Amino acid sequence: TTGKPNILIIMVDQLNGKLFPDGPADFLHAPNLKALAKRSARFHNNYTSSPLSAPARASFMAGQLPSRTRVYDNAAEYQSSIPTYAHHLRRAGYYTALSGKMHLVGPDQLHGFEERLTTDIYPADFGWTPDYRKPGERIDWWYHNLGSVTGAGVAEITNQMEYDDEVAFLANQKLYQLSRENDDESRRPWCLTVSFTHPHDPYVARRKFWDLYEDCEHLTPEVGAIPLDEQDPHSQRIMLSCDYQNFDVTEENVRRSRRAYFANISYLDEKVGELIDTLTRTRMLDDTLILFCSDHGDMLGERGLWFKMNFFEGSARVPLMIAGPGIAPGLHLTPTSNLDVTPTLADLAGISLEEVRPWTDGVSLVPMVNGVERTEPVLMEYAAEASYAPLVAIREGKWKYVYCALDPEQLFDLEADPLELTNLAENPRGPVDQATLTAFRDMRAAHWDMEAFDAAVRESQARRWVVYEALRNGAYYPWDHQPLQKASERYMRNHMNLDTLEESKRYPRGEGS
Amino acid sequence: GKPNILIIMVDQLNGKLFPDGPADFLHAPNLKALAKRSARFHNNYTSSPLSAPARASFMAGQLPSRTRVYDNAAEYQSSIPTYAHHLRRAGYYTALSGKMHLVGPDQLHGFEERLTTDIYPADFGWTPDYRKPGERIDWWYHNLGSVTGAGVAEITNQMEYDDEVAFLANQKLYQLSRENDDESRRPWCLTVSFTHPHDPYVARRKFWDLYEDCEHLTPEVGAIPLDEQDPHSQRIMLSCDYQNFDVTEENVRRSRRAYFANISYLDEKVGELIDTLTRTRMLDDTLILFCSDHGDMLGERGLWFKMNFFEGSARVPLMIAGPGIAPGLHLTPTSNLDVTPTLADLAGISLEEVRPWTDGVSLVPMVNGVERTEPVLMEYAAEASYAPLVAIREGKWKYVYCALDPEQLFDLEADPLELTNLAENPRGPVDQATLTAFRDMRAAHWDMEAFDAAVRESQARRWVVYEALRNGAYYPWDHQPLQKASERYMRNHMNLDTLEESKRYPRGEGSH
Amino acid sequence: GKPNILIIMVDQLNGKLFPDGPADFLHAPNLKALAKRSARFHNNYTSSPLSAPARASFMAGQLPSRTRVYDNAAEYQSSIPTYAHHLRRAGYYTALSGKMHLVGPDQLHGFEERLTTDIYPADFGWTPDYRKPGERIDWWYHNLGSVTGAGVAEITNQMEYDDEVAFLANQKLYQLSRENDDESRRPWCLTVSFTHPHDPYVARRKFWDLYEDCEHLTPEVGAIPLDEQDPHSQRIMLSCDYQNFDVTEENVRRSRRAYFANISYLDEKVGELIDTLTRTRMLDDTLILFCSDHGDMLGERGLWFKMNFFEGSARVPLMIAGPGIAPGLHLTPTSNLDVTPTLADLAGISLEEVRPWTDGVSLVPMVNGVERTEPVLMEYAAEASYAPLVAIREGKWKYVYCALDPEQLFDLEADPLELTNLAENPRGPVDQATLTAFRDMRAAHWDMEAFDAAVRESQARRWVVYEALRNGAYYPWDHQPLQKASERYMRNHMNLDTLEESKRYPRGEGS
Amino acid sequence: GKPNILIIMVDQLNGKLFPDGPADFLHAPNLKALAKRSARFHNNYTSSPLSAPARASFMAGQLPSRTRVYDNAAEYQSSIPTYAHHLRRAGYYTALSGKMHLVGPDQLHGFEERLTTDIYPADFGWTPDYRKPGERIDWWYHNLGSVTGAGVAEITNQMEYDDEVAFLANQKLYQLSRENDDESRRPWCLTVSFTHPHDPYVARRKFWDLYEDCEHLTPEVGAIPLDEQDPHSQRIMLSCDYQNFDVTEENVRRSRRAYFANISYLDEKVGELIDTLTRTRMLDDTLILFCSDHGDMLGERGLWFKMNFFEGSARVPLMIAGPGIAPGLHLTPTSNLDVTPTLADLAGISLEEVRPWTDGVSLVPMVNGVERTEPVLMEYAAEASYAPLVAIREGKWKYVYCALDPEQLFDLEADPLELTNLAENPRGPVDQATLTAFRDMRAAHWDMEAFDAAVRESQARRWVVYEALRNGAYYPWDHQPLQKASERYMRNHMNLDTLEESKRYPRGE
Ligand SMILES: [Ca+2]
Ligand SMILES: [Ca+2]
Ligand SMILES: [Ca+2]
């Protein structure tokens, strides 16, 4: 029975989850997300499943780990037969739509979404394929580099602001269109994903929002740059992949990058308020669950690192909030995962556990919201640029454990060491630290065959090097999504009942005052 | 110096009808003429007796268990290299006119250009369900209505399709010939993939009239009663709804007659393509390959269509002619799996570049007289199976295994009609040793329990996704050819001083 | 021709729970049935979010600044006319069963008869002091111990009280029906004033079990940290000793579950009253009014109880059914101040008789489709205030002023949970013009310096007087219902022949 | 070590009869012996010439305009502090035997215990109406029938009342004496408030016979005819319905004779209280205050009763005797407004605890030789007024104002009988300057138009309320004294061997 709630998923890109200690941090100018946070169940220790765009987003859609989706990097094909939350909801009777980006690679640019309002900002082809056969070599034309840090600043239009302006406009327009069915008893409930590209770099913001942070006290990272020689091996691979030696990052560069990033959160907050105002005025808010989420974090100069690709807090933590009918507001400290979003959504929509159990590696967060302890650990994977073999991580209780066949292990006690400055795998405090390291090693072997993981990643890369080079010979066939809204069926046309058209398009109906 | 490549593919052509080129009784002058100048692989097999699995496997030179295209509704991943990718990577312009039954949103799988849509769906509709053994889906399963409905018409769904496939292929050849005189041209590879002689068995009168005196309108083995059929054959008859059709001897003769007529319909189209190649002066530089995806039992044993490993269903013709190809008849068993490595080899691509991507072998050494020893493998995991089946063809033997069924072993030299199952009725110790050798070879190649679990998981995925995709507004995956009218023929942004010259070929007396 | 009037009043009922009658999720069949035949005032506000100021203002139809009942220990002058006086003057028998939190020696204030004592004290104990801003008083201030102590019990102080209130109210209706056949009978007005769902949040198991599957056991806005609270909310949070209590999520759920249970408890008593009216054949001649004195935040924003102008605290239900009342839902804001002139109007009293004595307006024109334009006014001047607060509700707007605090402006159609203070954070030019207009409206209704000086003098008087009165033998003011035993039932001075007939009703019937 | 306080209050006693204690011609041996040991305030005034306004003002030490008790039916709010409150706060036991004419449901106003009900109503019955000037309410207004009905009787409504008032007040002193030998005993303050010599002018024959040859049975200023009266006096004459009585010279003499007799009746009762204090050994530790609510014209000028600011109506006696009180006569005008701050001063209460609550001053400084300069203010806003009246008494002067009447100014030294109105015809520039001085002082003290509006609002409220309150079953506010018999005398839950000793006092051989 369709007493089912509507679902508005607001997503943003590259949002460091530590900036949401309990809703947005006090220092951020974000009135609309703070007001949303007060009505929300808030998951303080929520993690991405993979600190990179396409792997995190394919994993997010399916509620499955990259090792199961096979979307290892930003150029890996996402099979159209993999069930996503759009399939699960659509099968249960929802209209499903996406406005904005999801970095799906391959010719399927919908993956269950019934309608998609924008193209993607990023490529949909196999261009950005890493190569495990050439460790230490970087592809300068698509790899991250620190020019974002040295080029931060102020502008009134950017590639990303043109995208997000449009993402927001078409999202609010779709809500307005949906509200015209509000009185139809046979209406399908709806689930709209609004997926913004900010605050992803470039770190460039409109002057109105940049000015908000003139007096900002958080423009210096809380852990300074660690010299290359003192970095752990993965961090060294990242600084090399970012071409760090060819940039002189000053203190001012760091301050301007962080200022523009905070400004772009404030830019998004204005868009969040627009969406909620639309919901309020179309009389749809009380029946609508609102979920706020992100794909991965951004180190923001902490430890001298920028962007993502690692499991340190700033990169792996992303915010997660849920508000609406039946959701108790509150703060939750138990680690949760992006992998839990899809089963959480299925549960909120009234779908049985048995229908989604075969298709997800996460757990519904609804029992948490209703006072049931969650015990499952949080699992993460990374297998893209700046790795030479896959890395996996486990987050459970107060611990984070990181393994890569090529590197010394890492173990962090986040209650005693929230900034992850003391590796206990190498400097154990006592026998408990050693017993803990042993138990995580066994957990690691219970979840991953790291040799098979490496081999599968190498085969996936190898396929695409053959295929992508072929596809770039001769005439190119693009896979980018092209939204179509048929002009011949919109607004007023002479095959329609014109004395009924205006009433159909009007909502609310029959009112004055 | 790289040759052009024309691939002529037909659908559902029983390979037993090409004993040495087309059988004598077929009216097929153009294919018999092409055969005389071809290397002919008399004992060539499909890799899977079903359209999409055979075609995905044909395109990749990989077995269905590797492509994952188990049935007619299984997604074919776009990251899987095909002979299109391999040729295109080597510098070929590649194009497809006709069908390939690709399932999923990629309708090119490496082809640079595709001139027609597919005749069949590109979505997950036709998914079998191993969880419901014994039922059928009436709205897409085969049924014997094609046998009782055979006859004569001047247009059909398939004749509209194939008429269009032919026109656009000859037009593309004409278009390509305009680049003949430019030394920096790319060589081209054009696949022309017709839907005939696949059923419905309905032919144009012109071609139905050619077989009025035909002496092959009776199958060579008669209908085997259901109680005497091996279990898989029983499953095929149930899936075809055999009990609700009263197939008469006249139904059988008419179906076979129209089927032979449609081969002659195709033969005319082969002559058109050869004629285009001749008059455009590209024939001498063009390799010509003739192939099919699977066969058709055509009433033999009482069976119709495909879905099994018997000769009529699993045999398909294969020939290659052109520059550097010595003609002759080859008898060692070969596979559609070999087509992709054979193409790459003919195009000068190194064996090492294709080795990691193909389970077949190049046939070019065979064309040049080299003995072959590699066996021929086949798989089936779609409708009328309740669990996967596999077959091995080696020397004179064929072995067929399904976990649920008695094994089958045939000696095709002593028993070309596979009337004696030597697994059940061995002639002596050598047949017993042979069975054991094939058992061991099967176990080293397939884990049939892992195979069955992979097929089940693939079916279950699609049951969830397809039901969702059929809710709300449908988003189609069918390929839409686009030829930009604003850039064709005469337009006022173009150099009209040079347009006519560039579109004229050959450029003889009067041309610039 | 004058109709009977039954006023059903409950205590601390959050008006947001009555969007259109009781909300669907409440188990309240009797109040849902009453609502369906009622004029229902969706946006009805208390005039002061505290028990005694709200109740004295309700009785008089006058704001606290006029009644002088500023807090829960402020004397209510017996010379102030109430709806009981107005009706009694027009020929009504008037009676109260239940509480009214009247402070001072007059415990009737016009009621001709009162069937129970009060549940609360009648003296000057609970007196605030503006000369000591920042202190709290633990032996009478609200504290969060009600939240941590919520649960289930088969008797409580409040359930003993309300069981008696209900029994005597139904008994009185039965007594009154014996005069139905007399043409010269006075019409009656009976006020039944229950103490639930006021805390303690403790309910009978039977009603507790109704809400096991409830989806509203948590509030729509969570606890806002002290540092982010507006200053009045901060004063309140200190006032309930919020830091001395560890309020778990389960405490929140148990508290709201028992509160909902006690509404269902009340719903059963509403049905008994209606059933008595039905069987005595007085239903068709009786106006029924359902009301409350103030709301309860119930954990929203982290706040419990009242003392503020936020919706959960200031909104209270108001419903009217009966002869001459067209049913319907009304969204224009209305006020408890309006009940007294509404009642007098329904009783045939002229507007001129009541105009000099009321700050509200009759709602009868609303019921009959006539637009109401007067704003809704509210005041607070008790504990957790350091100076009086006033509020104005008009159109979609709510404006709150206190001379010690930043102003608050809410657009309730855009922001029904009041999460954006538009005085600090206007959305545009119209928010600003609207702020200026409310400031002008405020200066037109209130002299805030005179308000504060009158509150301070009243507090100081009582501090001198109460100290004295708690020395020596105490003289209590609690109402004691009259004793009539020698004139009740069968006594040998009466006529034992007509006695049974007089006490019987209906009379001379069979079937 | 705080003293006991006995307040003896009488009703309607003309203060001019106490020129230095009681006048010689009165038979009042006990009040004269008391006067001799008393500080005596010869020129003491009521704050309002009417029962309930005077008594509410007496208790609060606040003017009627501040108490809001404007007339004999105006509610007295229980939140207004009274001298009972102040003394109770300071550790005193406080009690009242007799009348106080408190209107409203509070019949204690801080008294811890009250031994009798009131002789007068406690409800809003006697409410005037400024909207109907010139009319009168015959069922409770004063009328001259008291003057024509004067005589002799052995029991009256008032003698029954005052006999019981006296008996319960002496019993209470006995009960209090049992606590004498207890160190932790609270000090006590007992107010004994008699209804005499208020009219009816009817006395017991014993006391009536004491004035056979009395030489003061003729008023010192005869009747003034209506058309020669000041307009307020005219309003009073109509309110008493004067033209419906033939008041003879005999009626005047009879009324004044019965009035003087009832002073003697009261004097006997004062002797009883004093004797009870003496024999219980509480006397030396007890302050004794003698006072009255308002006066009585007693025929002077042809007027009777009160309601005006003339000397006979506005003067009331005031005396204080006891520990720490130097005897002597004081001539500076004082006011009933001063009793409450005087009591609080005598009880050791600091001046700051009481100053925000009183419009009067402590008289203890005068008793001890400190000159007092504050003026004496009075107000009247009840029957026979159509708008409020105020008066200022300072030095030798009395100024009387009502917006609707000509002003009155009197020099009481040159003109003790108030026969020459210096506002209408002054003696010279000094008189004129004086009138101007008072006009300005009055304007600084009262807005008379705000006064009139508050009186009207109070009347209007009560007209709505009192009508309702008199429909249906009536709920009375009259005080019912408490007396648990189950806890009195000898009961079988107490220690009987111990009961007799604790109820016995003094406790010697
Ligand atoms: Ca991204
Ligand atoms: Ca096919
Ligand atoms: Ca209350």
Residue numbers in the entry:
A (entry chain A): 2 to 514
B (entry chain B): 4 to 515
C (entry chain C): 4 to 514
D (entry chain D): 4 to 512
What do the study's own words say?
DLS experiments performed at pH 8.0 show a single peak in the particle-size distribution by intensity, with a hydrodynamic radius of 5.7 ± 2.1 nm, which corresponds to a globular protein size of 200 kDa, also supporting a tetrameric quaternary arrangement.
The COSe from S. meliloti CECT4857 used in this work presents a single L105F mutation with respect to that protein (Genbank Accession No. QAT12853). WT SmeCOSe crystals alone or co-crystallized with choline were grown in 1.0 M Li2SO4, 0.1 M Tris pH 7.0, whereas the HEPES-bound C54S SmeCOSe structure was obtained from crystals obtained using 1.5 M Li2SO4, 0.1 M HEPES pH 7.5; they belonged to space group C121. The largest shift of Tyr123 occurs in the HEPES-bound structure and might be attributed to the bulkier piperazine ring compared with the methyl groups of choline. Lys102 is also displaced, but only in the HEPES-bound C54S structure.
